Amino acid sequence: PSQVRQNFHELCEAGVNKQINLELYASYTYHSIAFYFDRDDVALPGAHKYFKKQSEEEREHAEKLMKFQNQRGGRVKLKDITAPEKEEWGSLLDAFKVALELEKKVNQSLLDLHGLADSKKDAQMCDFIETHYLTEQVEAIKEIGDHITNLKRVGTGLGEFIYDKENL
Amino acid sequence: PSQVRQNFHELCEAGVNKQINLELYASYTYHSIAFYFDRDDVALPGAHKYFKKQSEEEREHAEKLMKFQNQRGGRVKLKDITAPEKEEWGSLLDAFKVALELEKKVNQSLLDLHGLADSKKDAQMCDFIETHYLTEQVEAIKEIGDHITNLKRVGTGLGEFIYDKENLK
Amino acid sequence: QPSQVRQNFHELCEAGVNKQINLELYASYTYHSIAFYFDRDDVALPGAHKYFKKQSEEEREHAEKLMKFQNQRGGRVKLKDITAPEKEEWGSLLDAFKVALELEKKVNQSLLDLHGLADSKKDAQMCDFIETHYLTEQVEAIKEIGDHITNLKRVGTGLGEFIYDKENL
Amino acid sequence: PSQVRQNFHELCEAGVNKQINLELYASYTYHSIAFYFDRDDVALPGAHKYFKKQSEEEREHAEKLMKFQNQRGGRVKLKDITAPEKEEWGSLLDAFKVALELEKKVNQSLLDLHGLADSKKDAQMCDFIETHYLTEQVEAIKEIGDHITNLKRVGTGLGEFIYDKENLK
Amino acid sequence: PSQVRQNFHELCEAGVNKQINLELYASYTYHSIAFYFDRDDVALPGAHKYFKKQSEEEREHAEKLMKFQNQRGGRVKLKDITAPEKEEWGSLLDAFKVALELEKKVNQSLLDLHGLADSKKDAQMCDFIETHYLTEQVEAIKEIGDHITNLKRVGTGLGEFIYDKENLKED
Amino acid sequence: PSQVRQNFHELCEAGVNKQINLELYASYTYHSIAFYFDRDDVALPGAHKYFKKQSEEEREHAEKLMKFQNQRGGRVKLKDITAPEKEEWGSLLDAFKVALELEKKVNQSLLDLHGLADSKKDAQMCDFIETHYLTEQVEAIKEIGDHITNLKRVGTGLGEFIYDKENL
Ligand SMILES: [Mg+2]
Ligand SMILES: [Mg+2]
Ligand SMILES: [Mg+2]
Ligand SMILES: [Mg+2]
Ligand SMILES: [Mg+2]
Ligand SMILES: [Mg+2]
Ligand SMILES: [Mg+2]
Ligand SMILES: [Mg+2]
Ligand SMILES: [Mg+2]
Numbered sequence A, F: 001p002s003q004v005r006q007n008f009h010e011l012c013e014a015g016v017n018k019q020i021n022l023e024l025y026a027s028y029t030y031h032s033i034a035f036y037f038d039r040d041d042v043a044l045p046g047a048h049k050y051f052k053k054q055s056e057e058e059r060e061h062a063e064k065l066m067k068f069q070n071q072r073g074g075r076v077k078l079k080d081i082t083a084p085e086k087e088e089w090g091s092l093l094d095a096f097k098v099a100l101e102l103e104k105k106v107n108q109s110l111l112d113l114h115g116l117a118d119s120k121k122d123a124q125m126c127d128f129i130e131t132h133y134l135t136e137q138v139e140a141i142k143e144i145g146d147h148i149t150n151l152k153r154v155g156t157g158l159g160e161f162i163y164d165k166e167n168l
Numbered sequence B, D: 001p002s003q004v005r006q007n008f009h010e011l012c013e014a015g016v017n018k019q020i021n022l023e024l025y026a027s028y029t030y031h032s033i034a035f036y037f038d039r040d041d042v043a044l045p046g047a048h049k050y051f052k053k054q055s056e057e058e059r060e061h062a063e064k065l066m067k068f069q070n071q072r073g074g075r076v077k078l079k080d081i082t083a084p085e086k087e088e089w090g091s092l093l094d095a096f097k098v099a100l101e102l103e104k105k106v107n108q109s110l111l112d113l114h115g116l117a118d119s120k121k122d123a124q125m126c127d128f129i130e131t132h133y134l135t136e137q138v139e140a141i142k143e144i145g146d147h148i149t150n151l152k153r154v155g156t157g158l159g160e161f162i163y164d165k166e167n168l169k
Numbered sequence C: 001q002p003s004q005v006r007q008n009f010h011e012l013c014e015a016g017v018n019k020q021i022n023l024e025l026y027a028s029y030t031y032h033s034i035a036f037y038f039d040r041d042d043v044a045l046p047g048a049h050k051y052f053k054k055q056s057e058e059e060r061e062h063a064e065k066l067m068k069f070q071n072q073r074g075g076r077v078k079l080k081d082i083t084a085p086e087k088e089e090w091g092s093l094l095d096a097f098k099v100a101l102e103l104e105k106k107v108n109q110s111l112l113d114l115h116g117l118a119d120s121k122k123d124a125q126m127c128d129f130i131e132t133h134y135l136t137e138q139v140e141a142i143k144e145i146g147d148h149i150t151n152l153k154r155v156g157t158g159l160g161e162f163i164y165d166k167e168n169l
Numbered sequence E: 001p002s003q004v005r006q007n008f009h010e011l012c013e014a015g016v017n018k019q020i021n022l023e024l025y026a027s028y029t030y031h032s033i034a035f036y037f038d039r040d041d042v043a044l045p046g047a048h049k050y051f052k053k054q055s056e057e058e059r060e061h062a063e064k065l066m067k068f069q070n071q072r073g074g075r076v077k078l079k080d081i082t083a084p085e086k087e088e089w090g091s092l093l094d095a096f097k098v099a100l101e102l103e104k105k106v107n108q109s110l111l112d113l114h115g116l117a118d119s120k121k122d123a124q125m126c127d128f129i130e131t132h133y134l135t136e137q138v139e140a141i142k143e144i145g146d147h148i149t150n151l152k153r154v155g156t157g158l159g160e161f162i163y164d165k166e167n168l169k170e171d
Helices: A010-036 A045-072 A092-119 A123-153 A158-167 B010-036 B045-072 B092-119 B123-153 B158-167 C011-037 C046-073 C093-120 C124-154 C159-168 D010-036 D045-072 D092-119 D123-154 D158-166 E010-037 E045-072 E092-119 E123-153 E158-168 F010-037 F045-072 F092-119 F123-154 F158-167
Strands: none
Touching: A010 A045, A010 A092, A010 E045, A045 A092, A045 A123, A045 A158, A045 D123, A045 E010, A092 A123, A092 A158, A092 C124, A123 A158, A123 B158, A123 C046, A123 C124, A123 D092, A123 D123, A158 B158, B010 B045, B010 B092, B010 C046, B045 B092, B045 B123, B045 B158, B045 C011, B092 B123, B092 B158, B123 B158, C011 C046, C011 C093, C046 C093, C046 C124, C046 C159, C093 C124, C093 C159, C093 D123, C124 C159, C124 D045, C124 D123, C124 F158, C159 F158, D010 D045, D010 D092, D010 F045, D045 D092, D045 D123, D045 D158, D045 F010, D092 D123, D092 D158, D123 D158, D123 E158, D158 E158, E010 E045, E010 E092, E045 E092, E045 E123, E045 E158, E092 E123, E092 E158, E123 E158, F010 F045, F010 F092, F045 F092, F045 F123, F045 F158, F092 F123, F092 F158, F123 F158
16 A cells, blocks of 8 residues: 555545546547647637647646546556547537537536545545536536527627637 | 704605615616626626626715715615516617616606705705716716617627627627 | 536525525625714714725625526526615624624524535535635634624723724724 | 634534644654754754754644634633654654654544534534645645655665755755 | 648548557657656656656647648548556656657658658658658657666666656756 | 764753753743634734744744754753643733743743853853843843833723734
């Protein structure tokens, strides 16, 4: 056992390792969407920059968790990062619709992980997930909700280009 | 009778407390409108910022009447603030139409208050109403009128998003 | 149909938020009242006037923050009338700060009741939100008041109330 | 009971008073280590500066708890601060081995104190420990484990001198 | 067929997508090495900073080929990103040995991809790999070569600490 | 042993260690008086700040004697830091009355140590405590003297509050 390890269940160590995969998976999906909007047949430069930053924030959510593993004295176990479920993401609206599902999936995965923290009475692991993840997820989902509502209000023609140029 | 009271009738004093309530009611209604546009299924952040400023300005309107009351020797009496008329405020144009009837409602209240002050030969209350409320209210009604005219020019859909970003931010 | 953002947010919790925003605004309304009582010519404590105005506004932002929370999680903001304050005449500075200790303890307990509901329905984020923005700010507000109450007891009734107002408010 | 006391069990107060002593014992222990490295036969100036700072950072932890005791309306009870368990601390590696055993004892005291807090539905007190202590202890234990790993790597003689100059100042 | 596409063979398009995967594999491997050094039993914060950096440069190598794939009107195609060969990377010298082998592997695929571009008379694709990839990889291999020679010269204990603080925690 | 040791008596080492405990004792006592003024039913924030400043200055008095012990080549020996004599320190005037007596006890202790150093012809040790301790103690006792006088002058109620703002 690590010299720093105290109050850190091997089941919670496994839990964290499953999260860093989900986040890296999320990161990799935003990256696909990012470079899909750089396509000459799509040409939406604001979505390219927005989803590239969304991808970089998840490599960070993963790093922070990788950081948390070493802090608590766990051992980081990587698995393959699965390819995104799509190659063509359709409209700007379709892309945010995929974003909302991805974020809900990740939120739940953290809510279950937090569940597993409370269960084995890991007050610090809980704080860590409350403080860096749970409110940042709620913020992220509202933002995506707002984007969906505004992409529906704008049409699919002129409004898409304007929303791309102004709100991303 | 307050040591400061001079040429300040008790129906006028009653009249100021009725106005104070109308300002808090308007504030509350604009508070409602401001947070309806923060909803994920509405999401007009311009309208959010705008109606929040309008609510803070009606509280300042109430506060100046609260202050005025104390200046004249009167005594501030607070009633309940009635909840806004609706939960769901509809489109941007629907929200600004409510705002117009509201401001005409409080404008009419102020003009009646002026009339009362004037029948009781209270010059300084007339000046106070003239100076801080009546021109404020005409400007505020002309502003709302323009927003309505513009919200009808721009359509629903894209029109609502452009006007939100360009004219409320 | 639920809001497209709504996840892990029980309707008891939603209904909970809506109840706390009213209490927040009830408390804002009461502090406003204490505010302008100190602005009266026959009370004339301009420190206390400033202190309570600032207090009224902070609670409007506490409700304003809970309206943001409501919309973030997919809940729907529902306003009731804001009850009028319990008193017109708030007495001495010490009396006013005693009403503030009663009021902040009701509001703290209302939040601690709301957290427990949060915890009941395994709503981790709502618990963090009430812990982060409300529970520590309440404990700081109540201690400040106790200190004020103590210090208002230590100084006299007369000269002492003037100095405390000038100096600590 | 203090005029500010609300949802603060007298076992949570007793618990808070046990932790101020543990922080002061750790503070005192780091103070001995500090001045052991200032001895002409140890002469390690980085460790001296480091462990003085570690001692100063406790006492602040003791103070933040004495501070919270008063916030909640509890009553600070000061027991003897027990002498360090040694005069002679040995190597720089030997000192960080003691720090690791000390910080875990401290951590386990804080986790125990949190569970007692959770047991008596003291949401704010849990939030206090979570915010100010639980994360701090973890960062602190990781830092001490890194130090231990690093002083085994360079190992005795020049490696001790360099680790003192480069990684402690 | 893409409105911009001109003088871009479907096997070349196929080759670019194979490099983006190798570059994302390298980024992931350097990502794993990075956090190994942040373990409390490895505690080498210089190597952690340094491999953290080398990993982000590989996601940038991938992004430039993604960016290029789009410019030529080819379509980006994402395979799974294979988990790294190990969790126990060993010594600072061991990690730099795994890096000289990972970097000679990427360079050879890059040299084959250029060969293919030349084969298909794609001057621009060739120039593009010459400009952003070929001398960067040579520069990257020379730098790792020097690290290995230096990790060899310094000790296993104290030498590993100094070299971390001096040549990697700075850089 | 000690390669730096010269003209330093084993009773002088012992006296220094005895003085370090007295200074840490005073620090603890000022500490208690600190947070006693931080109570919601006492609430004198001036006194709180003043006594926190005095607790730190004594730990400093302790640290400088620890520093002196090592300079002369003696060995620091720590004992338990005795807990304060009271929990409830009463009035602002009560707390300064306690300060004076603590300061005089600590001063007489220094004057005994100086005497002991003089008896052993430790010229540097006498100057050390003359330079950093004996005059500082006289300045501290007289400051407390002024405080006691002024607290009697201001009296019990308002004057407590006014002296706490204006003069601490
Ligand atoms: Mg994420
Ligand atoms: Mg108005
Ligand atoms: Mg005029
Ligand atoms: Mg509040
Ligand atoms: Mg501590
Ligand atoms: Mg918590
Ligand atoms: Mg590369
Ligand atoms: Mg002293
Ligand atoms: Mg002399």
